[PDB]
Structure 1
Amino acid sequence: AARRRPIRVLSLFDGIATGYLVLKELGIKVGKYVASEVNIKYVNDVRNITKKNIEEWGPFDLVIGGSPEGTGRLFFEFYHLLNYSRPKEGDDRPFFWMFENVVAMKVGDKRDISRFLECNPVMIARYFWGNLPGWSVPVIRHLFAPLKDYFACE
């Protein structure tokens, strides 16, 4: 129940590639960095990810994405990727995720994405989602500080 393996991650919109730097700043190393957009690794696009790709490259631990045209386009592709990368039913492996969205978005979208993710919205003049206890880098640093719960810790 201690000294876990280095974490491996899958993400959408790696972008600035600051996730690896943030992870290394906390004093831990990432076991495998996986990304797909068109040791930050870029291979293909989100639109050409299949089930077998997740079978060969998974399983993962958490996902960093969000919505920094339409919100539905990226949101539902994110939902599909997360549903493909979900851990099998009736198991115990730790698993996290994350979704970002701007404040300016209609109430109907709030309703749909609260129904879909099955988690109630949480405000931060800022928005955050997910089941994780806890741009502008201080909020990501605050979220990644308790990362030791499911990381390498003796």
Structure 2
Amino acid sequence: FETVPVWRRQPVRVLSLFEDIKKELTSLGFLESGSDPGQLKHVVDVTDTVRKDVEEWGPFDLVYGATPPLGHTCDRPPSWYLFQFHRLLQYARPKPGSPRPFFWMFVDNLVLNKEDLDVASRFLEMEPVTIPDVHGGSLQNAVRVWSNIPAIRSRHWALVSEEELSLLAQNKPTKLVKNCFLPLREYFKYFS
């Protein structure tokens, strides 16, 4: 997908699953501050939603998937969130002809086991990239991301490995994932 002239960048239409990022997304100017629902649709439980629902919910420009934040409050198995995310994604993808750019993304807050990770990457057709938020004096934020966003992947983020990410599994957003979402600014309207 090539980049779009600034005067044709229409407002983004997003569908967020299992987690509402309306607050995080409005912060960086993607949704009108007031009374513009048509940009984000949110669903928490998906086991009963059919393609005809997603098709009728209006075409989407971004489909966001996220796991529950680290905490012993998940009735669903960790693999359930991806399988359902992959289930709806093909419901939301437009016709083979591309009228506009279509994006998707799936983030894990370090809840998937390794075999859940290899199943995740096989279904999303890419190995994930890791986004660390390090300041030396802080070890706070770290998530894994599968997405077709061209700029989230290429930038050579700070390379640190998983036994320190499992020091965060001994520990068993504003700065880190807002930096994740910025490259979407170059494709849709900035509301300021």
Q: Shorter-chain TM-score: which interval?
A: 0.7 to 0.9
How do 1:1-154 residues align onto structure 2 when only pairs under 5 Å count? Answer: 1-3=5-7, 4-14=9-19, 17=20, 19-30=21-32, 32=38, 33-37=40-44, 45-68=45-68, 69-103=76-110, 105-124=112-131, 125-132=142-149, 133-134=151-152, 136-152=173-189
Which is greater in Rg?
2
SS of 1:22's partner is: helix
Mapped partners of 1:85, 1:55: distance in 2: 6
Does the 8 Å contact 2:107/2:143 carry over to 1?
A: no
1:140 shift after superposition: 1.8
Structure 2 counterpart of 1:42: none
Unmatched runs of 5 consecutive residues or more in structure 1? 38-44
User: Structure 1 CA distance, aligned partners of 2:106 and 2:49?
Assistant: 19
Letter in 1 for 2:65: G
Q: 1:82 to 1:91 in 2, by over 3 A?
A: same
Q: CA deviation at 1:65?
A: 2.0
In structure 1, what is the Cα distance between the partners aligned to 2:42 and 2:57?
11
Q: TM-score, normalised by structure 2?
A: 0.64
CA change 1:144–1:120 in 2 (3 A) is: same
Structure 1 segments, 4+ long, off by >6 Å, are none
Identify which range, 54-63 or 96-105, moves more after superposition. Answer: 96-105
Higher strand share: 2
- The DSSP-based 3-state class of the residue aligned with 1:97 is strand
Quote the RMSD (CA, aligned, Å).
2.2
SS at match of 1:137: coil
Q: How far 1:9 moved relative to its partner? A: 0.9
In 2: Cα distance, 1:77 partner to 1:49 partner: 10
